[PDB]
């Protein structure tokens with residue numbers, strides 16, 4: 001089971017079937033955020049997917065191959081968060097990203113709040129390319145969420 | 153163990169709900185991959 005697309009990452013270790021995160025299958029590689037799997041192996045039906053690359057500081061992890069997602073926010077246009085919340089169908093949310101300004105540079109940020117298990121849902125540009133993964137962000141004064149557009 | 157199930161294609165939807173603002177924030181990324189407001 002390796003066709004391109006967005007996938008839910010489920011676990012059976014707690015009560016019932018829990019969704020801990022989301023991932024993107026592209027070019028035979030499965031992309032997600034480190035804190036979702038924390039590097040653990042994943043089942044895809046009969047087959048098993050094993051970690052290939054990971055980086056806790058980037059909060060990213062690849063499976064069955066090197067990271068393949070290289071599209072980047074253009075810093076002007078709006079983008080779409082293909083959010084996949086636990087128990088609910090995929091939903092596209094258009095927005096204009098903000099900016100995380102850091103010592104080492106600026107990264108796009110999306111001010112959309114979703115359940116913890118939404119970690120890893122892809123972010124797309126107008127041409128459909130995945131520009132990053134939603135999940136690694138901060139909490140501001142009001143108390144809601146701003147996620148980076150985490151790209152590998 | 154964990155497992156994955158497919159949830160859809162990666163597509164831009166022309167009739168999508170627009171929302172969310174665009175803040176400019178000063179943040180720091182520590183060695184453990186956690187962002188913090190600065």
Ligand SMILES: N=C(N)N[C@@H]1CCCCNC(=O)[C@H](CCCCN)NC(=O)[C@H](CCCCN)NC(=O)CCNC(=O)CNC(=O)CNC1=O
Pocket residue numbers: 035059113114115116117118119135136137138139143144145184185186187188
């Ligand atoms: N908290 C708001 N408003 N939104 C998020 C949206 C969904 C989140 C998906 N990403 C995640 O979970 C990652 C996992 C950890 C990644 C570490 N690299 N964590 C986060 O990125 C942040 C921001 C890092 C803190 C910075 N010092 N940590 C929190 O947010 C804790 C607050 N905890 C509650 O608020 C109680 N639980 C909830 O509110 C459920 N929804 C949320 O946590």
